[PDB]
Amino acid sequence: MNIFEMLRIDEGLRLKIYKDTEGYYTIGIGHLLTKSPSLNAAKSELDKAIGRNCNGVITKDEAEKLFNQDVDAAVRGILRNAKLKPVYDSLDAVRRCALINMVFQMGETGVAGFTNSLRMLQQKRWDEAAVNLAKSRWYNQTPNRAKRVITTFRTGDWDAYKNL
Structure with missing residues (x-):
């Protein structure tokens, strides 16, 4: 076992914007996007993070890159x-x-x-x-x-x- 496999067990993988245990907007393998309550603020951070127009959705590839x-x-x-x-x-x-x-x-x-x-x-x-x-x-x-x-x-x- 290694750090990536451990964290991936702890965090999971979601390819669509979701809410934390805390109610925060997150995507991928536990990548917090914003603590702000607007899905719109979250979406904006998402595209900024990935460098494209994601429309709240990412690929597996993109999730692992953020995880790296x-x-x-x-x-x-x-x-x-x-x-x-x-x-x-x-x-x-x-x-x-x-x-x-x-x-x-x-x-x-x-x-x-x-x-x-x-x-x-x-x-x-x-x-x-x-x-x-x-x-x-x-x-x-x-x-x-x-x-x-x-x-x-x-x-x-x-x-x-x-x-x-």
Whole structure:
């Protein structure tokens, strides 16, 4: 398993503009287009992102391209972040994947705020950190996905995704 396959299990693939768990306009493999309530604002961002007149619809090819950009930007964002970089560097390959998924879902900003969990992951206190991560809006709102990520950080292997 790798980061792209993991995220593709978590996010799915939709070739038509859709609403987030949050009600936000998104397309493809979890590509947020706008937090704005107009389908029109969303459509405009879509064509800007793809470089064509999409009319709210994209190809598989286009979805994967956005997904390539998105993953690359998550990693690079982690690397530039003074709070994130040190944890990422301390982690093994699998757990690095679990950090990248949080960042993809919630943004650099959102993850850098899990101060206490970050500290525990750096320390390699896997069980304590899993407990701490679960105490969040994140876990309460998307419990199945949060639990998959959390298991990945606790175990260090891909079993949560084997099922799936």
